[PDB]
């Protein structure tokens, strides 16, 4: 079992039924991630950085938001010398896409525990940072009388914690990158915008579609 | 590599001691479970088969100095035994004559020590030694 897998075929999902037939007529390839509850952040993290090896326009636009992202969280109340090392890892992956690297060279860096997790953390921090900015807006999208800050201390920031629509809406609007999720049970996040990152949700898993 | 402190190591040792390793022919645990100092441990060895120790329960006491696990524990038999390295009056284990205590690495645990004693009971110069009567202490 790898963290992030090879560009496997969509016919491999019959090994785990007419609902995949509908999925084939709109998609061709799948990319598996370890079902450790950190799926969403690793899947989006690869899906979008791999797509930036073709798109220099979105690359420098993405780098501008990500760089400014660090000072944003610090202006929001995150201690700087906390997130520094996960930002340094995040910027080092953007610099590794900027320098034209292979999809296989990028994959080998995502299967490194340290490098990958450090990114997942910063993606979680980015999600958690944005949820607390739009605190007034998301207040009534959380159940159990949990506050936005508490939800962030319990389900967003800590590792190995499952993601649902509240995480997806959040990260999407933070980096200004649209996502579409397909449910092995279609939804666009945010509403209306053209999707850049296609994902497949099964109970406990998030997968990259193509 | 990275040094682990006395107390945080000994709590792990306790945990593993509670879950039990292998079959159970070696087991350990705190002498008092309200003892926050984590110093006195109760060891237990079932004697290895085909030797003169076979099918005898040997209770031990193990003590962890303020410097564990950088320096070995002091180990002592409660149950009487006839074995190279163990004193006939006290049941104390001579640190020089035991290859795990003499050649002590910090990675060694109270588990490793108890198995090492259980291994040395299988040694040729121990397995055939005449034993004292069963269930007898110092």
């Amino acid at each position: 079992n790898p963290l992030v897998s090879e560009r496997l075929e969509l016919s491999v999902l019959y090994k785990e039924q007419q609902k995949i037939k509908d999925l084939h007529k709109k998609y061709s390839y799948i990319r598996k991630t370890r079902p450790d509850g950190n799926c969403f952040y690793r899947a989006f993290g690869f899906s979008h950085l791999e797509a930036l090896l073709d798109d220099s326009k979105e690359l420098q636009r993405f780098k501008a938001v990500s760089a400014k992202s660090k000072e944003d969280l610090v202006s929001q109340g995150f201690t700087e010398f906390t997130i520094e090392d996960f930002h340094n890892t995040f910027m080092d992956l953007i610099e590794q896409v900027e320098k034209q690297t292979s999809v296989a060279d990028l994959l080998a860096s995502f299967n490194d525990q340290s490098t990958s997790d450090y990114l997942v953390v910063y993606l979680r921090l980015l999600t958690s940072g944005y949820l607390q900015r739009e605190s007034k807006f998301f207040e009534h999208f959380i159940e159990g009388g949990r506050t936005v800050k508490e939800f962030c201390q319990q389900e967003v920031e800590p590792m190995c914690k499952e993601s649902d629509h509240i995480h997806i809406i959040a990260l999407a609007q933070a980096l200004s990158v649209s996502i579409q999720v397909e449910y092995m049970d279609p939804h666009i996040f945010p509403e209306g915008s053209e999707p850049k990152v296609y994902l497949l949700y099964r109970p406990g898993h998030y997968d990259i579609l193509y | 590599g990275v040094k682990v402190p006395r107390n945080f190591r000994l709590l792990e040792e306790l945990e593993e001691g509670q879950k039990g390793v292998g079959d159970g022919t070696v087991s350990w645990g705190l002498e008092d479970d309200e003892d926050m100092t984590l110093t006195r441990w109760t060891g237990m060895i079932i004697g290895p088969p085909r030797t003169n120790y076979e099918n005898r329960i040997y209770s031990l006491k193990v003590e962890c100095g303020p410097k564990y696990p950088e320096a070995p524990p002091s180990v002592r038999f409660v149950t009487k035994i006839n074995m190279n390295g163990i004193n006939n009056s006290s049941g104390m284990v001579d640190a020089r004559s035991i290859p795990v205590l003499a050649k002590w690495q910090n990675s060694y645990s109270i588990k490793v020590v108890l198995q090492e004693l259980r291994r040395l009971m299988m040694s040729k110069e121990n397995m055939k030694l005449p034993q004292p009567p069963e269930g007898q202490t110092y």
């Binding site: 995150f78 201690t79 010398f81 906390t82 997130i83 520094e84 090392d85 996960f86 997790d117 953390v121 979680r124 921090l125 958690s128 201390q153 319990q154 920031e157 800590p158 590792m159 | 990275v2 040094k3 682990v4 402190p5 107390n7 945080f8 709590l11 306790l14 479970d33 309200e34 926050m36 984590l38």
Partner: protein
């Protein structure tokens, strides 16, 4: 050593939490001798409680290890000093720092549980016979925390 660990030690010493001394060991920069004064108005007032903090191999991915050295009658603390606290297991994020853990423990002492009760023999005693429990904690502060 990560830059994280060396910077956290320096910031923790630069700005101390009142009621908590926390010096790193010069021999093992991952180990911290923590001392906490028993909060005024608590059942632990006048007592001084020893704790130890260790930053594991995985830190800051894995949570810090903390344990009471001083015997204490408290729902969240057990007979060997092991602290039952969310941000030390499940709900620990790599973003959280030591001083969060540190004064989180202090908040516990200030006003013992339960906002959601944990299931143990001490916590059950607090959940019913509270006045009796507070006098027990006062007594244990005397014989364990006061020298």
């Amino acid at each position: 050593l990560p830059r994280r660990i060396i910077k956290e030690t320096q910031r923790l010493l630069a700005e101390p939490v009142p009621g908590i001394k926390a010096e790193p060991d010069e021999s093992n920069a991952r180990y911290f001798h923590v001392v906490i004064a028993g909060p005024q108005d608590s059942p632990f007032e006048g007592g001084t409680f020893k704790l130890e903090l260790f930053l594991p191999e995985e830190y800051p991915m894995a949570a810090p290890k903390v344990r009471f050295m001083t015997k204490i009658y408290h729902p969240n603390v057990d007979k060997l000093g092991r602290i039952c606290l969310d941000i030390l297991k499940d709900k620990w994020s790599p973003a959280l720092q030591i001083r969060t853990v540190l004064l989180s423990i202090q908040a516990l002492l200030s006003a013992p549980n339960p906002d959601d009760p944990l299931a143990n023999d001490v916590a059950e005693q607090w959940k019913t016979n509270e006045a009796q429990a507070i006098e027990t904690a006062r007594a244990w502060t005397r014989l364990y925390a006061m020298n």
